[PDB]
mmCIF file of N, CA, C and O in Angstrom:
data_model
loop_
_atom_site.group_PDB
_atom_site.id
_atom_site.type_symbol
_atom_site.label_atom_id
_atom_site.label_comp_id
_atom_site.label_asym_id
_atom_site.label_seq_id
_atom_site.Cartn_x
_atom_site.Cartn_y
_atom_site.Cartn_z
ATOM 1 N N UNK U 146 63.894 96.029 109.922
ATOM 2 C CA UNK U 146 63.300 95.878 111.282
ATOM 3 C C UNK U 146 62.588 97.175 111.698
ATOM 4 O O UNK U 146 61.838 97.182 112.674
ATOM 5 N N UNK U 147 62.775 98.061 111.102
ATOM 6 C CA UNK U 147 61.586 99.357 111.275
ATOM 7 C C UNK U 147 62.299 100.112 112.241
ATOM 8 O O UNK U 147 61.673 101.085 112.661
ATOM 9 N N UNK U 148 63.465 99.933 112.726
ATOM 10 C CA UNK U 148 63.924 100.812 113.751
ATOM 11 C C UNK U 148 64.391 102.562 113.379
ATOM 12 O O UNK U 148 64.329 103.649 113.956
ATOM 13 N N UNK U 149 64.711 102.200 112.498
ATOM 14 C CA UNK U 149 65.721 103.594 111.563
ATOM 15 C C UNK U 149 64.450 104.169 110.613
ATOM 16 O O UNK U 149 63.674 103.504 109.926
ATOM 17 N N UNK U 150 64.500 105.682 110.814
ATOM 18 C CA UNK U 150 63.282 105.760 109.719
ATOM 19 C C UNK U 150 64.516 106.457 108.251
ATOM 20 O O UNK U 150 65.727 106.353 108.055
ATOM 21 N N UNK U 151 63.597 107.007 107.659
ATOM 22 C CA UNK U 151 64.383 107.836 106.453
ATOM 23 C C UNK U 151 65.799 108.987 106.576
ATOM 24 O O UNK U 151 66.887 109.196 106.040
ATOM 25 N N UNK U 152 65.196 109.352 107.320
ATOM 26 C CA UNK U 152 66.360 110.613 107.962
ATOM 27 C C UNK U 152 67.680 109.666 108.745
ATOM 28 O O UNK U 152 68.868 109.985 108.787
ATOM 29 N N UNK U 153 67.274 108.892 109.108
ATOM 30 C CA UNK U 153 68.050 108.048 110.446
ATOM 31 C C UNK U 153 69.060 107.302 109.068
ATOM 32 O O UNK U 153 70.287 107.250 109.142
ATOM 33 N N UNK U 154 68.509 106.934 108.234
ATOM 34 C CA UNK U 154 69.158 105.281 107.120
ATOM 35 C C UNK U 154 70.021 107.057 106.112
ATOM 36 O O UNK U 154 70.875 106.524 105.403
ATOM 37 N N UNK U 155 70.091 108.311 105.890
ATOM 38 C CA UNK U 155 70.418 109.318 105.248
ATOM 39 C C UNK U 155 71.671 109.733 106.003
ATOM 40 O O UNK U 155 72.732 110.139 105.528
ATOM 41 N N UNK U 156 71.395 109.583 107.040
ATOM 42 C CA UNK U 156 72.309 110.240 108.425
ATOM 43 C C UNK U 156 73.681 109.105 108.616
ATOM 44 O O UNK U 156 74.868 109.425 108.673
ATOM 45 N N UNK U 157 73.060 107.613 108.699
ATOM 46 C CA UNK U 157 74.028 106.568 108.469
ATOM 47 C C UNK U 157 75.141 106.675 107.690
ATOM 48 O O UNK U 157 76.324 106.720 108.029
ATOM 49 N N UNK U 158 74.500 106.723 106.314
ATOM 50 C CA UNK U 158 74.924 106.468 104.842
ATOM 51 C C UNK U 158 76.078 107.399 104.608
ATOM 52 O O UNK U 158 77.243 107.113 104.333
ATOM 53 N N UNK U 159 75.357 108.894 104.819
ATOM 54 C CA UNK U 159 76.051 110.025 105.196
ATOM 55 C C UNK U 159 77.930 110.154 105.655
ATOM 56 O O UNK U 159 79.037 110.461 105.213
ATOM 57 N N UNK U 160 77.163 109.634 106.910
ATOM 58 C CA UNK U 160 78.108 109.672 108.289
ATOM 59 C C UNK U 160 79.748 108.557 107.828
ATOM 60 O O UNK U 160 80.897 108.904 107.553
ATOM 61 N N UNK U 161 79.119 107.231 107.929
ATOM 62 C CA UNK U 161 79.836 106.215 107.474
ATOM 63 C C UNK U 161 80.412 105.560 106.134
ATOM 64 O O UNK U 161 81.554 105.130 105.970
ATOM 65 N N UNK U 162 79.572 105.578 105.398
ATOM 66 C CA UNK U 162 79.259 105.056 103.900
ATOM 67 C C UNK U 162 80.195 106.273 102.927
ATOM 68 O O UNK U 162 81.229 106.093 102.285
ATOM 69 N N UNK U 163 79.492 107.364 103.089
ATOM 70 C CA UNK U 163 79.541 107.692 101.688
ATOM 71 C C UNK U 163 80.848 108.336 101.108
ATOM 72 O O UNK U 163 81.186 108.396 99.925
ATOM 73 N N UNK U 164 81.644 108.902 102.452
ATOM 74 C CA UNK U 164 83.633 109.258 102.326
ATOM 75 C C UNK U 164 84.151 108.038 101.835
ATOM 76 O O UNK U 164 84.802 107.909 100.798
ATOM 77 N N UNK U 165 83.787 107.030 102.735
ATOM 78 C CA UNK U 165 84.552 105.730 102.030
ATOM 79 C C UNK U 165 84.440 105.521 100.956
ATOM 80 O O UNK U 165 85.420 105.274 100.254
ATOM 81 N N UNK U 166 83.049 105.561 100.430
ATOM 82 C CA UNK U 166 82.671 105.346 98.394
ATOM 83 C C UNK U 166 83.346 105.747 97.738
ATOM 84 O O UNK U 166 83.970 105.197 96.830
ATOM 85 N N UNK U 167 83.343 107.538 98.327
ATOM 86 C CA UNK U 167 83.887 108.699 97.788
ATOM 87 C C UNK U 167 85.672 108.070 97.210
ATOM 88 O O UNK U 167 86.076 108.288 96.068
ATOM 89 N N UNK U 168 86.251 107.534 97.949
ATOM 90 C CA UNK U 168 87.895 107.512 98.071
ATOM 91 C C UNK U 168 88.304 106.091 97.459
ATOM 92 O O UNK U 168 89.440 105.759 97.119
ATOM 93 N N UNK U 169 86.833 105.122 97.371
ATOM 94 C CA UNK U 169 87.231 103.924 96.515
ATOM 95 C C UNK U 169 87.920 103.955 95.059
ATOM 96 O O UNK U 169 87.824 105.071 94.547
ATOM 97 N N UNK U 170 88.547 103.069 94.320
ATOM 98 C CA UNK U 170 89.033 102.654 93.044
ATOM 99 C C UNK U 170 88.431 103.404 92.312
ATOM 100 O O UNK U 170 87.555 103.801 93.080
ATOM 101 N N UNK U 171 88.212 104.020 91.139
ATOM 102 C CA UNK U 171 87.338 104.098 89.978
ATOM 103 C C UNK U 171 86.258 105.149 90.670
ATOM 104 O O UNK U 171 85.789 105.693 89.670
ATOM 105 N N UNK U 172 85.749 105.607 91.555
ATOM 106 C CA UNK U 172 84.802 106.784 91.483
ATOM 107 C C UNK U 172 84.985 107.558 91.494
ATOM 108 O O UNK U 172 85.893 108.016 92.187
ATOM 109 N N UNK U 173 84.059 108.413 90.537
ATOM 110 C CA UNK U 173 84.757 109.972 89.889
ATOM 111 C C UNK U 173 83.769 110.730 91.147
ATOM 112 O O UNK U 173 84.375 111.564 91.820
ATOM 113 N N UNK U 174 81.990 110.440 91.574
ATOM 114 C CA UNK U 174 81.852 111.603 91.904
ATOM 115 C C UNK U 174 80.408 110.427 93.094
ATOM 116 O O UNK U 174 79.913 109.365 92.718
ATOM 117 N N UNK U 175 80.189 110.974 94.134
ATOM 118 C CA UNK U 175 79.285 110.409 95.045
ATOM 119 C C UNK U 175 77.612 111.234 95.151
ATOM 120 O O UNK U 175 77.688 111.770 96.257
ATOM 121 N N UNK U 176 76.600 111.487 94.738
ATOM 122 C CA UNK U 176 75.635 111.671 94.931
ATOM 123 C C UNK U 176 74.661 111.197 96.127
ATOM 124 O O UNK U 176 73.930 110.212 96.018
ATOM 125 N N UNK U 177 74.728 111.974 97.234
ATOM 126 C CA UNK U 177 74.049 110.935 98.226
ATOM 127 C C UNK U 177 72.569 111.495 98.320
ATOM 128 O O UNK U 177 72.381 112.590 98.851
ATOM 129 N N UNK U 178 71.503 110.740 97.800
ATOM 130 C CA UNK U 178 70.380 110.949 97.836
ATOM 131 C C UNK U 178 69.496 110.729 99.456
ATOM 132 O O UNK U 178 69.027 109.657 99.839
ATOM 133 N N UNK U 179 69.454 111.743 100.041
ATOM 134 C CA UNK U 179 69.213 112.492 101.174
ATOM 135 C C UNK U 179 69.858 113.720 101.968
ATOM 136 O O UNK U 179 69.765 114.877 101.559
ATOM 137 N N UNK U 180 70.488 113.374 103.087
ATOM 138 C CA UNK U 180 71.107 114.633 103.898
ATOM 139 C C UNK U 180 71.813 113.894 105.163
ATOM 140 O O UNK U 180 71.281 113.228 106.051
ATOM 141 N N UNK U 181 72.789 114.130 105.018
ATOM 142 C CA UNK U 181 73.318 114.092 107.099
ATOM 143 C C UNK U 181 72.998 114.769 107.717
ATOM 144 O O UNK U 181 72.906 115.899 107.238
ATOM 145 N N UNK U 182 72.555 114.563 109.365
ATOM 146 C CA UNK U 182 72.082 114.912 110.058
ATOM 147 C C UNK U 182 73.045 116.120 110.367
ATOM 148 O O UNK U 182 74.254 116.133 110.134
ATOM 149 N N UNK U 183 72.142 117.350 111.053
ATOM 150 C CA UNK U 183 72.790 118.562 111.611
ATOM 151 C C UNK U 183 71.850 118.799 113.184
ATOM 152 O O UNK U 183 70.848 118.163 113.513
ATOM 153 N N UNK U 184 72.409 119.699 113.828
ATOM 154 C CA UNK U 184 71.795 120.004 114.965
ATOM 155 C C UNK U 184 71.041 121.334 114.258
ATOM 156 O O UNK U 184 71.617 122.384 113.973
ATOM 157 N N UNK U 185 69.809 121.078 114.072
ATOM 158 C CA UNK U 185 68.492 121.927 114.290
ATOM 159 C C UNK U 185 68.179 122.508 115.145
ATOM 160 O O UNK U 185 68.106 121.925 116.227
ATOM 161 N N UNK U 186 67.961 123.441 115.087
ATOM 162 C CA UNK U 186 67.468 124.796 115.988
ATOM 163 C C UNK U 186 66.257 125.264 115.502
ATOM 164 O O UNK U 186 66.103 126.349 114.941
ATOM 165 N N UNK U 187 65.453 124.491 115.707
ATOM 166 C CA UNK U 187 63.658 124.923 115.135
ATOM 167 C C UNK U 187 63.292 126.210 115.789
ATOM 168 O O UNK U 187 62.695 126.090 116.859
ATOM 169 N N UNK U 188 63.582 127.687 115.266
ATOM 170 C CA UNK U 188 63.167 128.605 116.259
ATOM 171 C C UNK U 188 61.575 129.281 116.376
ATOM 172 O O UNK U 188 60.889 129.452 115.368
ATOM 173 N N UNK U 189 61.181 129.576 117.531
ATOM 174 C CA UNK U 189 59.717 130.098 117.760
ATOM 175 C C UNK U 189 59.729 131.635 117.923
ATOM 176 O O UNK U 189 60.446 132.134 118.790
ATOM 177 N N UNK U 190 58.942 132.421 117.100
ATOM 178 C CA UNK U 190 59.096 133.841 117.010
ATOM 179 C C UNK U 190 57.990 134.541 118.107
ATOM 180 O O UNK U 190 57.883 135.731 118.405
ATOM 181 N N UNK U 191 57.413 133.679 118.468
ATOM 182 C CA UNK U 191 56.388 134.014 120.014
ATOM 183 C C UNK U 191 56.977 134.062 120.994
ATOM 184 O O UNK U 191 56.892 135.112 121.631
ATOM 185 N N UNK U 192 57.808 132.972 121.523
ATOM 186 C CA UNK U 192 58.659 133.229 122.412
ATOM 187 C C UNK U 192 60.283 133.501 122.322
ATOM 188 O O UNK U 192 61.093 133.498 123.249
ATOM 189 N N UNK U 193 60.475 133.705 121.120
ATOM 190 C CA UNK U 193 61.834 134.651 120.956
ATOM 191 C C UNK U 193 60.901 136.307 121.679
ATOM 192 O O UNK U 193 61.516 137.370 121.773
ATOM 193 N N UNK G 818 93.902 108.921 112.889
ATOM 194 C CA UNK G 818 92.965 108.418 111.671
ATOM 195 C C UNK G 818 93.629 107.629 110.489
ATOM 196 O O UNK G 818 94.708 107.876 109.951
ATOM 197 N N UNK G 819 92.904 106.809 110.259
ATOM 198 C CA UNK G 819 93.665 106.156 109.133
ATOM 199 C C UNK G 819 92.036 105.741 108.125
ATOM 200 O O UNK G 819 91.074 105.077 108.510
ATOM 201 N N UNK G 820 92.222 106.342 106.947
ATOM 202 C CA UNK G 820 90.673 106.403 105.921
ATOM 203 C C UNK G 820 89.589 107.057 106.838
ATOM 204 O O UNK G 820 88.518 106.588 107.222
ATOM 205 N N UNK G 821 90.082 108.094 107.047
ATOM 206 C CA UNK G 821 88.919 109.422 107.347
ATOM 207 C C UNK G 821 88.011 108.962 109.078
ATOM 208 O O UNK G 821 87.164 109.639 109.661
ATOM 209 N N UNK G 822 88.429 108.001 109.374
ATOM 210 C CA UNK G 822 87.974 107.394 111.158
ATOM 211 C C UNK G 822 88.911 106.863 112.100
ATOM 212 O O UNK G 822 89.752 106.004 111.835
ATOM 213 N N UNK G 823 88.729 107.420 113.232
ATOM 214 C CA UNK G 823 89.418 107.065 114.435
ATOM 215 C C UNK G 823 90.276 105.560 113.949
ATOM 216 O O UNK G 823 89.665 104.665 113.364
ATOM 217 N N UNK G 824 91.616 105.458 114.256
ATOM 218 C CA UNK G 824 92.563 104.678 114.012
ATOM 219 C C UNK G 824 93.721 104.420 115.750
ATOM 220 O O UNK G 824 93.649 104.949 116.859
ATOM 221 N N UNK G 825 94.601 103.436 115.197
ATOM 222 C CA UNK G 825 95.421 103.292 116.140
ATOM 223 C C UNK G 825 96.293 102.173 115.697
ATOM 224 O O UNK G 825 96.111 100.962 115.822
ATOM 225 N N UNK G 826 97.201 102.776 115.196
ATOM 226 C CA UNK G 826 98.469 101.872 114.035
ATOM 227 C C UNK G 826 99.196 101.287 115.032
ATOM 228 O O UNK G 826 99.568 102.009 115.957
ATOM 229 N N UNK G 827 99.651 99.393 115.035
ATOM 230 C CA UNK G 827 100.185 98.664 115.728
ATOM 231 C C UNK G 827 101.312 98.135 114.670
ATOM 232 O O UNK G 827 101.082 97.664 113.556
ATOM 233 N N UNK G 828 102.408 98.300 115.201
ATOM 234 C CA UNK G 828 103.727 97.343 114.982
ATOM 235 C C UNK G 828 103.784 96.531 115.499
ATOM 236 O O UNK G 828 103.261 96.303 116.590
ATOM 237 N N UNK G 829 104.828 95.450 114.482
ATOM 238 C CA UNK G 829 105.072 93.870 114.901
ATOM 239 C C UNK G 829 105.698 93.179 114.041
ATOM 240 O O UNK G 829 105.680 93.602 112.885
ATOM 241 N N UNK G 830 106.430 91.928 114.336
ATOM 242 C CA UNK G 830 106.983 90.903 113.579
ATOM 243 C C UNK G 830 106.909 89.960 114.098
ATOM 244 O O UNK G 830 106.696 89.777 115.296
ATOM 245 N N UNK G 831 107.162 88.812 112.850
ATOM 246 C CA UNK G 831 107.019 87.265 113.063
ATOM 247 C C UNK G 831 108.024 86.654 113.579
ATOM 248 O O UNK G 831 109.184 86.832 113.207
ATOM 249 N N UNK G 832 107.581 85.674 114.719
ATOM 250 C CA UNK G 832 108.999 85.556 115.321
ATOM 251 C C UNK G 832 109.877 84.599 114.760
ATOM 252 O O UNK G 832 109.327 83.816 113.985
ATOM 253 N N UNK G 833 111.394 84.409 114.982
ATOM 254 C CA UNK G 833 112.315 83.596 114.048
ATOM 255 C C UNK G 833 111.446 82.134 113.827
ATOM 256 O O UNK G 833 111.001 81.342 114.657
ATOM 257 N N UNK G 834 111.403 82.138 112.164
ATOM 258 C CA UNK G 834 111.416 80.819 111.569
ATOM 259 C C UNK G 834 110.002 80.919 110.853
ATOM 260 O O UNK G 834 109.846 80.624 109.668
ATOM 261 N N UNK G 835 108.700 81.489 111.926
ATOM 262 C CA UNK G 835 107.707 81.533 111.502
ATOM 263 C C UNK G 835 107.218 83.684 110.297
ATOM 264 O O UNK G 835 107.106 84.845 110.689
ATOM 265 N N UNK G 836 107.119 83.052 108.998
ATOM 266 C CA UNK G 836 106.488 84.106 108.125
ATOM 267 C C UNK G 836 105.455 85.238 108.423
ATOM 268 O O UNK G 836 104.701 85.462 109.370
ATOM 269 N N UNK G 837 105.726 85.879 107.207
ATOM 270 C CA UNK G 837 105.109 87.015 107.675
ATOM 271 C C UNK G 837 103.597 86.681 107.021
ATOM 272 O O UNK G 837 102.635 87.285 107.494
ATOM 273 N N UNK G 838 103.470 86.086 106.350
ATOM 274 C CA UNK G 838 101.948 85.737 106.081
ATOM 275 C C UNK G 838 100.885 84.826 107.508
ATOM 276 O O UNK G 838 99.678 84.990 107.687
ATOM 277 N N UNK G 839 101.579 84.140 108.116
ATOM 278 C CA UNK G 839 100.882 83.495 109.428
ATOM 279 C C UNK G 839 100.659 84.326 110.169
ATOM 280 O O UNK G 839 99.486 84.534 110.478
ATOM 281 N N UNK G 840 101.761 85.144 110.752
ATOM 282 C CA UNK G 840 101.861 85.817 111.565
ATOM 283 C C UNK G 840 100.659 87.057 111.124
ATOM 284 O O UNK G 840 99.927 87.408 112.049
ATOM 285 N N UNK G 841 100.550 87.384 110.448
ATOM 286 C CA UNK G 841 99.455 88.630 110.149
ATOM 287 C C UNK G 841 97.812 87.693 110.338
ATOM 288 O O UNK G 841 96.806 88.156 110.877
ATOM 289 N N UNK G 842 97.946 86.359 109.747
ATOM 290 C CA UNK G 842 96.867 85.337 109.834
ATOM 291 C C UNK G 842 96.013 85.880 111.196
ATOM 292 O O UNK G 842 94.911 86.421 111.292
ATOM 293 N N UNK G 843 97.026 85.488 112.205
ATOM 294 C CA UNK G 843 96.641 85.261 113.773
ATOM 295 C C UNK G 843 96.191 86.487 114.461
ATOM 296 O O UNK G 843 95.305 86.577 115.311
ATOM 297 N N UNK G 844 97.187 87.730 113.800
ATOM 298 C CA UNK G 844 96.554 89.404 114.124
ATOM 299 C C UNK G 844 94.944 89.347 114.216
ATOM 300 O O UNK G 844 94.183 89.593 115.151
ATOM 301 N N UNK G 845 94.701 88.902 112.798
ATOM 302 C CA UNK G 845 93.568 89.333 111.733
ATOM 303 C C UNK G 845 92.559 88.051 112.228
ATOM 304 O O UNK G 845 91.447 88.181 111.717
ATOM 305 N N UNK G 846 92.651 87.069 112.934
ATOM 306 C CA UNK G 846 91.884 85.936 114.249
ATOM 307 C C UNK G 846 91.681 86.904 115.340
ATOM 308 O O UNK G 846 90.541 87.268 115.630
ATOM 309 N N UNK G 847 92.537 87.264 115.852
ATOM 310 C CA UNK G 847 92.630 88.306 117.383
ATOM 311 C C UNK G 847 91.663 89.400 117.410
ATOM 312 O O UNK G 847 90.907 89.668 118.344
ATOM 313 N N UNK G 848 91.788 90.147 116.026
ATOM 314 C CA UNK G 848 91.298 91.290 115.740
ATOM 315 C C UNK G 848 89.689 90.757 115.686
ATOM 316 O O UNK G 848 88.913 91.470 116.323
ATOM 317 N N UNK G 849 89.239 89.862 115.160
ATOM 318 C CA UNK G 849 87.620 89.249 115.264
ATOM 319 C C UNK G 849 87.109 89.025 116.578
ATOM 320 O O UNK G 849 85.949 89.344 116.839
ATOM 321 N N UNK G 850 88.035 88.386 117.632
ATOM 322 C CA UNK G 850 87.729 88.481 119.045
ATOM 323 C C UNK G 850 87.184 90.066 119.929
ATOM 324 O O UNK G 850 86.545 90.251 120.965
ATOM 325 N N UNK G 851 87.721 90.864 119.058
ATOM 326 C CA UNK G 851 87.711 92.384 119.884
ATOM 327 C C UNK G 851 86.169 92.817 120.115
ATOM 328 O O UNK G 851 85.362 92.279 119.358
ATOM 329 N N UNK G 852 85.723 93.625 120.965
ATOM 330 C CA UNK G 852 84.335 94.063 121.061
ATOM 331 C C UNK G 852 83.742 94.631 119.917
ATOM 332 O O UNK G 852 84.346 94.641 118.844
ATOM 333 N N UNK G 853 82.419 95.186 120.070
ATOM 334 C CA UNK G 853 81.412 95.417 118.553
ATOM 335 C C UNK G 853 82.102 96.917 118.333
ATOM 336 O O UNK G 853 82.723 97.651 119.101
ATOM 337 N N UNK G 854 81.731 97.034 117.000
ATOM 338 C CA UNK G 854 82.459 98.343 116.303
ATOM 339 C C UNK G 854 83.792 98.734 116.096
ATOM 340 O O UNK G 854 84.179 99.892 115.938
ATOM 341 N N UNK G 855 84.766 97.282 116.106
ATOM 342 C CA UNK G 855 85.949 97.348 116.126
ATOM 343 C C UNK G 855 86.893 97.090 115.493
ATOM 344 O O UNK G 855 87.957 96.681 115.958
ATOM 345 N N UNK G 856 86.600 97.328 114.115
ATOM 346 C CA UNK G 856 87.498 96.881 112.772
ATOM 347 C C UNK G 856 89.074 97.124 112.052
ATOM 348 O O UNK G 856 89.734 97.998 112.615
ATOM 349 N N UNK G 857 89.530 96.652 111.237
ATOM 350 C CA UNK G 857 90.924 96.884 111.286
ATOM 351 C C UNK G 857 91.451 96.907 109.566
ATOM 352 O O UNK G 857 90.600 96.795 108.683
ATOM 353 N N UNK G 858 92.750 97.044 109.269
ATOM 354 C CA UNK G 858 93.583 96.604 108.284
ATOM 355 C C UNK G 858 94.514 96.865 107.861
ATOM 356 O O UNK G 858 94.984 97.690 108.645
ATOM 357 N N UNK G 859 95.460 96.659 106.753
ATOM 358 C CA UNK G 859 96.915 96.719 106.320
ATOM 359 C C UNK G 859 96.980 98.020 105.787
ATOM 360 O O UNK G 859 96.110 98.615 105.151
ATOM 361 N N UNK G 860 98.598 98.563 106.258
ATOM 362 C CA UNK G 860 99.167 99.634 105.455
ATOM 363 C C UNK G 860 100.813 99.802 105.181
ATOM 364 O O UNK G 860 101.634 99.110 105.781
ATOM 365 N N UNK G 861 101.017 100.365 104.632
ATOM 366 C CA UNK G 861 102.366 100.686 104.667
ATOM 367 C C UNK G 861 103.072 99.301 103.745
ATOM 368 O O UNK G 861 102.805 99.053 102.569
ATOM 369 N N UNK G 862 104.015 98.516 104.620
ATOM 370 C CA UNK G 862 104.779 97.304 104.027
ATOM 371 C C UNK G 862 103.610 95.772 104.206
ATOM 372 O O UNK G 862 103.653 94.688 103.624
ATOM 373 N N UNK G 863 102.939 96.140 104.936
ATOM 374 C CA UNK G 863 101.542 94.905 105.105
ATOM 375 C C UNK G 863 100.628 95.256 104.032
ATOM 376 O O UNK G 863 100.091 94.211 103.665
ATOM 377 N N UNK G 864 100.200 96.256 103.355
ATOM 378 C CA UNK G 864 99.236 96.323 102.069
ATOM 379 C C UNK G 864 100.020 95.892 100.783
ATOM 380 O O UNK G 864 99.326 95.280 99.972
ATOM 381 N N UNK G 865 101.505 96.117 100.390
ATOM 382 C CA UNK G 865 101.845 96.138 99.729
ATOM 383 C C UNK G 865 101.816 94.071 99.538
ATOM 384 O O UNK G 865 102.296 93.536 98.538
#
């Protein structure tokens, strides 16, 4: 439905998904192809 | 927490005559009624 972009469906997966994978039957190791979200601090050296 | 997310472990038994397999039946009906994001399941002497 187009609501979630790339970062948003990474952040999900992340968040919810990928501990649980992690702790299932039989998996040795989880690779999550993207990133969970962090609080960013984009800083500006003009007005620093 | 119970599997790495917010939890809240409930006790109970089946009352005289009626099993412990129904009785968990009707939990696990109840538990589908509850509002969105509100999931559940067995531990301890109920997983086994």
């Amino acid at each position: 439905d187009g609501t979630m972009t790339q970062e948003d469906i990474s952040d999900y997966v992340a968040a919810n998904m990928k501990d649980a994978i992690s702790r299932t039957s039989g998996v040795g190791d989880v690779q999550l192809f993207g990133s969970q979200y962090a609080m960013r601090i984009w800083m500006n050296p003009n007005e620093l | 927490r119970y599997n790495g997310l917010p939890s809240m472990e409930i006790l109970g038994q089946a009352a005289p005559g009626k099993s412990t397999g129904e009785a968990m039946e009707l939990m696990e009906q109840l538990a589908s009624k509850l509002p969105t994001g509100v999931g559940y399941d067995w531990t301890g002497m109920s997983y086994q």
